[PDB]
Design an enzyme around this catalytic site. Structure first.
Site, PDB file in Angstrom:
ATOM      1  N   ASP A  43     137.160 100.367 124.703  1.00 29.96           N
ATOM      2  CA  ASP A  43     138.385 100.436 125.490  1.00 29.96           C
ATOM      3  C   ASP A  43     139.285  99.374 124.852  1.00 29.96           C
ATOM      4  O   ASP A  43     138.936  98.829 123.799  1.00 29.96           O
ATOM      5  CB  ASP A  43     138.161 100.157 126.992  1.00 29.96           C
ATOM      6  CG  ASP A  43     137.475  98.826 127.269  1.00 29.96           C
ATOM      7  OD1 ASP A  43     137.620  97.870 126.480  1.00 29.96           O
ATOM      8  OD2 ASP A  43     136.797  98.735 128.310  1.00 29.96           O
ATOM      9  N   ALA A  44     140.421  99.065 125.467  1.00 28.03           N
ATOM     10  CA  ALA A  44     141.339  98.090 124.876  1.00 28.03           C
ATOM     11  C   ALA A  44     140.741  96.709 124.586  1.00 28.03           C
ATOM     12  O   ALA A  44     141.232  95.998 123.707  1.00 28.03           O
ATOM     13  CB  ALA A  44     142.596  97.949 125.753  1.00 28.03           C
ATOM     14  N   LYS A  45     139.697  96.322 125.319  1.00 26.90           N
ATOM     15  CA  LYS A  45     139.072  95.016 125.115  1.00 26.90           C
ATOM     16  C   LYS A  45     138.492  94.902 123.706  1.00 26.90           C
ATOM     17  O   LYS A  45     138.379  93.808 123.146  1.00 26.90           O
ATOM     18  CB  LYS A  45     137.966  94.772 126.157  1.00 26.90           C
ATOM     19  CG  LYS A  45     138.478  94.676 127.591  1.00 26.90           C
ATOM     20  CD  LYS A  45     137.361  94.378 128.593  1.00 26.90           C
ATOM     21  CE  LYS A  45     136.539  95.610 128.972  1.00 26.90           C
ATOM     22  NZ  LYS A  45     135.807  96.210 127.827  1.00 26.90           N
ATOM     23  N   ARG A  80     127.235  94.980 128.552  1.00 29.87           N
ATOM     24  CA  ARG A  80     127.201  93.847 127.627  1.00 29.87           C
ATOM     25  C   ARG A  80     126.322  92.780 128.281  1.00 29.87           C
ATOM     26  O   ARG A  80     125.622  93.079 129.249  1.00 29.87           O
ATOM     27  CB  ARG A  80     128.608  93.322 127.300  1.00 29.87           C
ATOM     28  CG  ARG A  80     129.436  94.345 126.515  1.00 29.87           C
ATOM     29  CD  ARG A  80     130.756  93.801 126.014  1.00 29.87           C
ATOM     30  NE  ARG A  80     131.488  94.825 125.259  1.00 29.87           N
ATOM     31  CZ  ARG A  80     132.171  95.827 125.813  1.00 29.87           C
ATOM     32  NH1 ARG A  80     132.226  95.950 127.136  1.00 29.87           N
ATOM     33  NH2 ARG A  80     132.796  96.716 125.047  1.00 29.87           N
ATOM     34  N   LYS A 194     142.519 105.551 128.719  1.00 23.15           N
ATOM     35  CA  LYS A 194     142.483 104.131 128.383  1.00 23.15           C
ATOM     36  C   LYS A 194     143.711 103.771 127.555  1.00 23.15           C
ATOM     37  O   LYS A 194     144.067 104.486 126.612  1.00 23.15           O
ATOM     38  CB  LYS A 194     141.219 103.791 127.579  1.00 23.15           C
ATOM     39  CG  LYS A 194     139.918 103.921 128.357  1.00 23.15           C
ATOM     40  CD  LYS A 194     139.892 102.959 129.536  1.00 23.15           C
ATOM     41  CE  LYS A 194     138.503 102.886 130.148  1.00 23.15           C
ATOM     42  NZ  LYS A 194     138.376 101.784 131.126  1.00 23.15           N
ATOM     43  N   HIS A 325     134.875 101.460 141.371  1.00 23.62           N
ATOM     44  CA  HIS A 325     134.656 101.544 139.928  1.00 23.62           C
ATOM     45  C   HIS A 325     133.234 101.890 139.516  1.00 23.62           C
ATOM     46  O   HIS A 325     132.279 101.288 140.004  1.00 23.62           O
ATOM     47  CB  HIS A 325     135.064 100.211 139.285  1.00 23.62           C
ATOM     48  CG  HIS A 325     134.511  99.996 137.908  1.00 23.62           C
ATOM     49  ND1 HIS A 325     133.318  99.347 137.681  1.00 23.62           N
ATOM     50  CD2 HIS A 325     134.998 100.323 136.689  1.00 23.62           C
ATOM     51  CE1 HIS A 325     133.095  99.282 136.380  1.00 23.62           C
ATOM     52  NE2 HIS A 325     134.099  99.866 135.757  1.00 23.62           N
ATOM     53  N   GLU A 345     135.230 107.623 140.627  1.00 24.15           N
ATOM     54  CA  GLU A 345     135.272 107.599 139.166  1.00 24.15           C
ATOM     55  C   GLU A 345     134.029 108.232 138.548  1.00 24.15           C
ATOM     56  O   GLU A 345     132.905 107.893 138.907  1.00 24.15           O
ATOM     57  CB  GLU A 345     135.432 106.157 138.674  1.00 24.15           C
ATOM     58  CG  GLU A 345     135.397 105.986 137.162  1.00 24.15           C
ATOM     59  CD  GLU A 345     135.886 104.598 136.708  1.00 24.15           C
ATOM     60  OE1 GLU A 345     135.628 103.598 137.409  1.00 24.15           O
ATOM     61  OE2 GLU A 345     136.521 104.512 135.639  1.00 24.15           O
TER      62      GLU A 345
HETATM   63  O1  LIG Z   1     133.705  99.923 127.746  1.00 23.06           O
HETATM   64  C1  LIG Z   1     133.638  99.238 128.794  1.00 23.06           C
HETATM   65  O2  LIG Z   1     133.707  97.979 128.842  1.00 23.06           O
HETATM   66  C2  LIG Z   1     133.460  99.972 130.130  1.00 23.06           C
HETATM   67  O3  LIG Z   1     133.098 101.335 129.916  1.00 23.06           O
HETATM   68  C3  LIG Z   1     134.754  99.863 130.941  1.00 23.06           C
HETATM   69  O4  LIG Z   1     135.861 100.378 130.176  1.00 23.06           O
HETATM   70  C4  LIG Z   1     134.689 100.635 132.283  1.00 23.06           C
HETATM   71  O5  LIG Z   1     133.733  99.925 133.079  1.00 23.06           O
HETATM   72  C5  LIG Z   1     136.025 100.738 133.049  1.00 23.06           C
HETATM   73  O6  LIG Z   1     136.825  99.814 133.085  1.00 23.06           O
HETATM   74  N1  LIG Z   1     136.265 101.921 133.657  1.00 23.06           N
HETATM   75  O7  LIG Z   1     137.175 102.063 134.695  1.00 23.06           O
HETATM   76 MG   LIG Z   2     138.689 100.259 134.753  1.00 27.38          MG
END
Ligand SMILES: O=C(O)[C@H](O)[C@@H](O)[C@@H](O)C(=O)NO
Ligand SMILES: [Mg+2]
Ligand SMILES: O=C(O)[C@H](O)[C@@H](O)[C@@H](O)C(=O)NO
Ligand SMILES: [Mg+2]
Lengths: 395, 395
Positions: A43-45, A80, A194, A325, A345
């Site tokens: 994701d963006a992180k 993680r 995302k 979530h 979700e």
């Molecule tokens: O890749 C990740 O850190 C997780 O899949 C994260 O993006 C997920 O927990 C989230 O934010 N979904 O709403």
């Molecule tokens: Mg999220």
């Protein structure tokens, strides 16, 4: 006679007490398993360099059995680092469960917090209590012969559901558009994309394409995973008003309360946040600060169902919508119990852990008639188990 | 595999839903009964001329039976005018229960409020819902085979109990001292004395005598039933510090928030109030205003167990103690579920309505092993019934 000039006292023909007859926990099994992700997730992180791609998910499981024949199962997780610590702490405090009346969930929770007082009332320590807390609720529901949602009391028998797994940033736009179709044809009720990558223009490109493909009506939402600063957040916010998103999620750092509040007040588009918070206290600070229109608690992350219930009531009191979530296997029941129309979700990641699958149809996830959480551990869950321990003796 | 480059969806082998299999309410019986008080009762409200002596208590009962064989009983009441109205409204909305899943207590509560939207969300209308709401909780507990306290989750198996019926103002000091002994010998854990009469000196006289008789340690509390003005309240407060009371109750008008807050902040002696409030909202205003150290909700008065639970959580969050008013048959379970050490109020008035009696011992009231509320209606309750009606058909 109801009364007299003096005072009188009635005597109890049956002094049999609830204390002496209550059920008792006699066995507990904890497991640390790892859910492998064949396709590394970003994701963006990851695109901002804060983290490396996600390749697996830690799953901490608790199984509890009572003297009178009842059993409960529950779990927490870690994406993680965190799984080893959650399991280790759960293991160090689990024996406190032996001999306790499983129905006194809060009393037990308090005992567990005291047994680990040195490590706090938020974060990892409560996430180690989550599997246990959830298993106890699972057990109580089963004891009543009801799906958890019914034990809590439901406001709906199914909840709107949107997909997240098909909108990650490691996925080329082409494949994302294919995913939208797959999800839509499978009855999904919404799509979350995302965003928050360094290249803002690229996110706008991907977002416009998805809206284009979905048509004007279909529920669409975005998630920045905390990757924008305030300047960029409001800029992107303004530019996304046109897409009529159900919400913009985690536009800023999870703890930037005033930042979120500011965005929420400035945009008509709803703001959503909270998945990263790890306690009622943390969610309370964001809610009192009017950080978002949608509150997104995570039962495993905040310490289980017990604290999650408190968060729900607070959110409701402040007139906010609920969009839990991840962990739909648990959140389905909690959101079904929320007074205002919520969102669930979807991720397929945990499907292999259980023998039963949830029914997704006509945009909603339906609550089955199965008791408690309505799931049983699969053989695959055992195969993916790396560490395990037990306390007491199977009844 | 947990995931792939696209997105996949699990399918439900069993789509049997919670909606299609849930239990259903098929019968409901409402009753308006009157509990006669041989000895007219007078607290300060009578001595100041605000009201006439109390000679009876209205009891509104609800009995609910489900298709699958479960039953629940619950009640609300009225001291002086109010019983006819509570019963009448309950009667006008009761048929809405037929066909509902009894486990969705909040969903049902909401339906009942909408059916009577014109008459509000506080006061009499919710007091008409109380019997029903309580019966449904009674039923759910029974469905789980647990005393209500256990369904909610208990923090204790018995609760400190004090007597109120032997300390009224129509009772001569001589008889009050005799009552203290009777109560103490029967295992009471505390004594509450009614005060607030025009003759302040007389109350001080009676209070000093009771403390003298009880000795320095025994838990003692006073109740003015809103009969003092601010000037008198602080004056009497100062003068009672010496008695080390557990609390001073309703020193002022139930709605004088700042007045109570002021007394609470000025005296070390705890201040208690809230019995007259008729909703969560009302209690919330007093709690946010820091009106008292002890919050005293009344399940029947506030709309039942459901709202009472919300009040409990709010109180706890603000660090207040809980001392529910009257209806010990119901409050025993709720206070047992409160996180901080609570107090239970004793009256023998309702004993004749039920076949079972609560065990009072060593200063505490013990939770029996009986399911739900743990009470069944007595023949006397039927004899005292003046009006009754039914809906649906007994399963
Ligand atoms: O890749 C990740 O850190 C997780 O899949 C994260 O993006 C997920 O927990 C989230 O934010 N979904 O709403
Ligand atoms: Mg999220
Ligand atoms: O006489 C009355 O009005 C009642 O018995 C009242 O005093 C009682 O409900 C109370 O305040 N007890 O705490
Ligand atoms: Mg009182």
């Amino acid at each position: 006679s109801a009364n007299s000039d003096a005072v009188t006292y009635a005597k109890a023909a049956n002094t049999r007490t609830a204390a002496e007859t209550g059920d008792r926990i006699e066995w507990v099994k904890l497991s640390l398993a790892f859910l492998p992700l064949a396709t590394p997730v970003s994701d963006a992180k990851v695109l901002t360099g804060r983290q490396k791609p996600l390749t697996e998910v830690a799953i901490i499981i608790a199984e509890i059995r009572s003297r009178d024949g009842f059993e409960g199962v529950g779990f927490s997780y870690s994406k993680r680092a965190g799984g080893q610590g959650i399991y280790a702490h759960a293991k160090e405090i689990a024996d406190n469960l032996l001999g306790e009346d499983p129905n006194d969930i809060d009393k037990i929770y308090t005992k567990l917090l005291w047994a680990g007082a040195s490590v706090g009332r938020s974060g990892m320590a409560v996430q180690a209590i989550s599997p246990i807390d959830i298993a106890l609720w699972d057990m109580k529901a089963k004891r009543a012969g009801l799906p958890l949602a019914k034990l809590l009391g439901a406001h709906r028998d199914s909840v709107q559901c949107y997909n997240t797994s098909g909108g990650f940033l490691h996925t080329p736009l082409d494949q994302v558009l294919k995913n939208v179709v797959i999800s839509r044809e499978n009855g999904i009720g919404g799509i979350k994309l995302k965003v928050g990558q360094p290249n803002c223009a690229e996110d706008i490109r991907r977002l416009t394409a998805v809206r284009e493909a979905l048509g004007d009506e279909f529920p669409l939402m975005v998630d920045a995973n905390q990757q924008w600063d305030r300047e960029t957040a409001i800029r992107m916010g303004r530019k996304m008003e046109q897409f009529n998103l159900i919400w913009i999620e985690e536009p800023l750092d999870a703890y930037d309360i005033e930042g979120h509040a500011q965005l929420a007040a400035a945009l008509d588009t709803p703001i959503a946040t909270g998945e990263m918070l790890t306690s009622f206290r943390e969610h309370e600070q964001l809610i009192l600060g009017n950080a978002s229109d949608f509150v997104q608690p995570d039962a495993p992350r905040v310490g289980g169902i017990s604290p999650f219930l408190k968060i729900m009531d607070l959110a409701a009191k402040h007139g906010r919508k609920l969009a839990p979530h991840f962990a739909m296997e648990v959140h389905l029941h909690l959101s079904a119990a929320y007074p205002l129309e919520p969102w669930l979700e979807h991720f397929e990641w945990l499907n292999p852990l259980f023998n039963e699958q949830l029914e997704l149809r006509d945009g909603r996830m339906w609550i089955s008639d199965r008791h408690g959480l309505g799931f049983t551990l699969s053989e695959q869950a055992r195969r993916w188990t790396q560490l395990t321990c037990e306390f007491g003796k199977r009844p």
